[PDB]
Design a protein around this ligand. Sequence first.
Ligand code: FAD
Ligand code: FAD
Ligand code: NAP
Ligand code: NAP
Ligand code: NA
Ligand code: NA
Ligand code: NA
Ligand code: NA
Ligand code: NA
Lengths: 529, 529
Amino acid sequence: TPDLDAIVIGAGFGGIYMLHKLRNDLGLSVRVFEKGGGVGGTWYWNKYPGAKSDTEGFVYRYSFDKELLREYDWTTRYLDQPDVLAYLEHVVERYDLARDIQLNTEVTDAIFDEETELWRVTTAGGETLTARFLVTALGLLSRSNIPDIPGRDSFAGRLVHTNAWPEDLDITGKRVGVIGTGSTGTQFIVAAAKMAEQLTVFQRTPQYCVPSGNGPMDPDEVARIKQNFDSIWDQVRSSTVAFGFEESTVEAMSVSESERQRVFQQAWDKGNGFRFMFGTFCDIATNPEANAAAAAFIRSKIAEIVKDPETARKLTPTDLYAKRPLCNEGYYETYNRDNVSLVSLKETPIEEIVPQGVRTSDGVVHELDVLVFATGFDAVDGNYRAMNLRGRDGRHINEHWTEGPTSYLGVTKAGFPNMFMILGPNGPFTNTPPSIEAQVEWISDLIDKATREGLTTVEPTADAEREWTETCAEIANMTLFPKADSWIFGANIPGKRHAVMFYLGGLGNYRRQLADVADGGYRGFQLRG
Amino acid sequence: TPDLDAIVIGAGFGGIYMLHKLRNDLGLSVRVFEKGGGVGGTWYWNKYPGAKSDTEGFVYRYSFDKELLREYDWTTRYLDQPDVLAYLEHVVERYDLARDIQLNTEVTDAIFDEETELWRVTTAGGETLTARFLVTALGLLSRSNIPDIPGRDSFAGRLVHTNAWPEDLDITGKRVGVIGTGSTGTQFIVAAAKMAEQLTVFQRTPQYCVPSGNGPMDPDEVARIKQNFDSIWDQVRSSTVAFGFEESTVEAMSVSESERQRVFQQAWDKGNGFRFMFGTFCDIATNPEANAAAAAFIRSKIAEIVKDPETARKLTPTDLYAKRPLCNEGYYETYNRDNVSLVSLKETPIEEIVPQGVRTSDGVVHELDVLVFATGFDAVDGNYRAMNLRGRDGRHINEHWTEGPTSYLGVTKAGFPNMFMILGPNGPFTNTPPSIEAQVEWISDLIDKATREGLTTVEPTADAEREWTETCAEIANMTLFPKADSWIFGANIPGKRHAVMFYLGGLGNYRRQLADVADGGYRGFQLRG
Ligand SMILES: Cc1cc2nc3c(=O)[nH]c(=O)nc-3n(C[C@H](O)[C@H](O)[C@H](O)COP(=O)(O)OP(=O)(O)OC[C@H]3O[C@@H](n4cnc5c(N)ncnc54)[C@H](O)[C@@H]3O)c2cc1C
Ligand SMILES: Cc1cc2nc3c(=O)[nH]c(=O)nc-3n(C[C@H](O)[C@H](O)[C@H](O)COP(=O)(O)OP(=O)(O)OC[C@H]3O[C@@H](n4cnc5c(N)ncnc54)[C@H](O)[C@@H]3O)c2cc1C
Ligand SMILES: NC(=O)c1ccc[n+]([C@@H]2O[C@H](COP(=O)([O-])OP(=O)(O)OC[C@H]3O[C@@H](n4cnc5c(N)ncnc54)[C@H](OP(=O)(O)O)[C@@H]3O)[C@@H](O)[C@H]2O)c1
Ligand SMILES: NC(=O)c1ccc[n+]([C@@H]2O[C@H](COP(=O)([O-])OP(=O)(O)OC[C@H]3O[C@@H](n4cnc5c(N)ncnc54)[C@H](OP(=O)(O)O)[C@@H]3O)[C@@H](O)[C@H]2O)c1
Ligand code: NA
Ligand code: NA
Ligand code: NA
Ligand code: NA
Ligand code: NA
């Protein structure tokens, strides 16, 4: 007899829906443990100015409740962090979830007991509880990456990671430095430039930023979108990246030079990063000649927008357009402001952080009241490797992951029975919520089967997991994503294994893999009862 | 304007009473942050078998409320951990405190903002709140000391510190090892011997354990004590150690051999560790001749009780009787059992922890299922030094404490305005609760003065703190305590500064110092409005 049927870790998009399925639909005893002081995951932690969705609001939400789809209003094309947090708090209120979500509670240990065949979970607060089923919704992009830049801790001002933005901090009229120009840094830079006395950007690697097209939502369009939600979610679930647009089936180099310029300009004008990469042509991420045409178009727009030719050059990337697409409102324009300076760390790397700011290699001391680390995440496997997480024969998850992190179907792990992962290693690379929905519903169905049939353990075989690794490696190596040095393949952190950590076959093909496994009596699983 | 009048850290005896004064009596807005999953401090964390008070139950409790003194019942002469925890849970219940205690919440940062003159507090859960007043009840004996014994992490069974004892762990019928024989180790050994198939004790330093005389309380005795509580508490508050017995005023060597034997035998039969040290003669802990006579009596008792002469030899300490007194029921008798073995780490030290147990320098592999670290605490300063705690000029508490931890009166710190410590460095060495009450009441009185008069800051001067260090040094250096290597002077942890960390003048003289300062216009404080 376990203390609980199920323990879920994380109260983001993943954990919130998992608890709903397990407690509300299956009638099981469940507790969520969230180490944060509120629910919302991403949208609790990322309180920094400019924090917002790069999925358009209309499809950055749950689809499973048709009444919620009819009722809930959004006012902006992309959702500000406070509005996403408000939406998730509403979902929690709507299904009476708060009473079974324990906040401020870090799970430090999860130990599979091979005698009882129960999960023994320990918290930082010194609670030990047993559960039959463990669901880890720990976040692909949850564990803060804070590089050990020499002197970092000497800084006399406010030093923060974006994923730890403190609620009291007001940068209005302060001298602000930011390190990093990914999705976090660039949206922060647009907002911060309006507030700061001076904003200094420390950029190691410029990215191919495209317009978001963000602005007010016409409430009459929101009514029409709501009219067509059934067909919109149909298209989302059958797409690769699930961003709510029809993906191009046209090869970039199959059309005229004129047509390529027109298609790119039309996506530039319409906005969205995933639209630019996948709504232009079908081979931007696979054909290197297609990739170079897309990259060239983005460089041409930078040269048009940025007035200082030195700033233009430093903003203009020359590497593969194969990092995760990013978009913003008025990013390049921000660098035309009198109070924004760009420091290329390619030219003048950081030598040392000092009480008064940042000394770069040219010996210039950038005087700062606030230093912001927009330096990203120990992505995918970060919160797994930091946990004392042990399966059969008492083996730690790290012992299994010496060649990079692994899974079966992105949701299970050989040697870890009755353990399910929401966006574990080697799952889909998409607009997040519909991928979360696919995993949570499939996991719920298998937990319901194990309940009805009296199954004591369900686990994938080592062979099924190895074949899933091979399937992900085969798909990945036909794209340019492995040659971009991003968080996606673990190349953002010194000493992290460069490895496939996603199934890159898209939501459509991912959903088919899940369905065929379930159809075939849970192919690759040993079900015991 | 702060978010809260006061933030309190810790929900042991100290934080609970401090919240009661500030919320219930002064009517301030207050929150307690406790990183533990429940209230009780010591009595939450120490879930190990045998865990119990070495203060007799009648005075191991609050005195401030006559109604609670009249009502609450205890059934054993010493309080088992579940019974002390239930008492503290009842206190939280009856005083309506739970609504203002936030569990699972570790304070990572407390930063004095010199511009606002407010404390900025950050939680591991990502809350930042401001308070005018900060009270740290972090515990003298709260931060677990776990030595880096070679191969420790390789142990294949259940390895636990006593202060992290997991609720699920049943040692019944298992091969158990324990490292340590202080108050924790010895009370655990008595309880664990009745459960374990085999209990191996890894003893580096045997101590002068005396009988507790624990057993059932006659309910007529409890009724008798409650009728006399006013005179019992008056004697406690003007005593030195506050254990509820009259302290001897007779010099051990001023009486005959026969009288020394009679007085020692009397204390031995009556029981209690502090009774033996301070209830026999006035100079056991100050006069090395008196110390020797007390030590010799205890050794003679070990020889009587322990049947195997080799075991008796290993149990018999030959160093100063100048570590904290410790008492148990049937400790030496436990070693007459067939399932208890004693390893002297003086003779055969631990060379390595291996998957199957412990290898001593005699090459013996001790085979264990469970390895218990009864290795004590980073005492007094542990939880302060681990905090990002900063005062005036942005200085970390560590920068103030390079020659050991310091305070003014054990409750304030120079450079740290509006910050108060419950059992901070250089406070009393007593039965805990009456010392906690003296400090909480003094702190409440000064916060109440500060509120009434509109004071923005209260702080001790550097000079007042330096004088308090010297006072504590003068008193400490007239005792044998500094000559014996124990947690009391920081000598239990490699690399930790050997320094005075207590005022050893006793509760009566400590209370006089607090009163003289307050009545004398807060001598040594700068009060600012
Ligand atoms: C600023 C920002 C904007 C983004 N915008 C988009 C977007 O527009 N579109 C998109 O598709 N994706 C976006 N993402 C990616 C984003 O991660 C997902 O959209 C989604 O929010 C993730 O939900 P989740 O529940 O999987 O994880 P999270 O929201 O990260 O939740 C995981 C939770 O687990 C908790 N946790 C982890 N380990 C433990 C532990 N051991 N014990 C207890 N709790 C633990 C964490 O505290 C966290 O709250 C964005 C990310 C960021 C940072
Ligand atoms: C087994 C045992 C028995 C004892 N018996 C006796 C006895 O009989 N008589 C006696 O006089 N003394 C005894 N002691 C000493 C004991 O410490 C005190 O009696 C008393 O319990 C201490 O109360 P406190 O509130 O000062 O500290 P604690 O009870 O230690 O409470 C401090 C709390 O602060 C919390 N905390 C610390 N840092 C942070 C942070 N950064 N954020 C959030 N929370 C934090 C900790 O989690 C802890 O719960 C005993 C100790 C032990 C271990
Ligand atoms: N618009 C949105 O909705 C939004 C916003 C925030 C984040 N997100 C999500 O979160 C993901 C992560 O984005 P992110 O911007 O937080 O992280 P990221 O994409 O990994 O970017 C981190 C940035 O920090 C830099 N950096 C890392 N280590 C450094 C070091 N030692 N010195 C200097 N610079 C260093 C990186 O440069 P290098 O390339 O040289 O390593 C890069 O510019 C996104 O891809 C997206 O999925 C979304
Ligand atoms: N009321 C009670 O019954 C009770 C019970 C528990 C604790 N307490 C309180 O808590 C305090 C702490 O007592 P405690 O027993 O937890 O700790 P302690 O008195 O500090 O004892 C620690 C023990 O561990 C040993 N040890 C430490 N490091 C070691 C190492 N590296 N290798 C081997 N042995 C090692 C010590 O021996 P060395 O000295 O040789 O290193 C000692 O025997 C008590 O003094 C008391 O105030 C009270
Ligand atoms: Na909200
Ligand atoms: Na996603
Ligand atoms: Na089974
Ligand atoms: Na000792
Ligand atoms: Na005894």
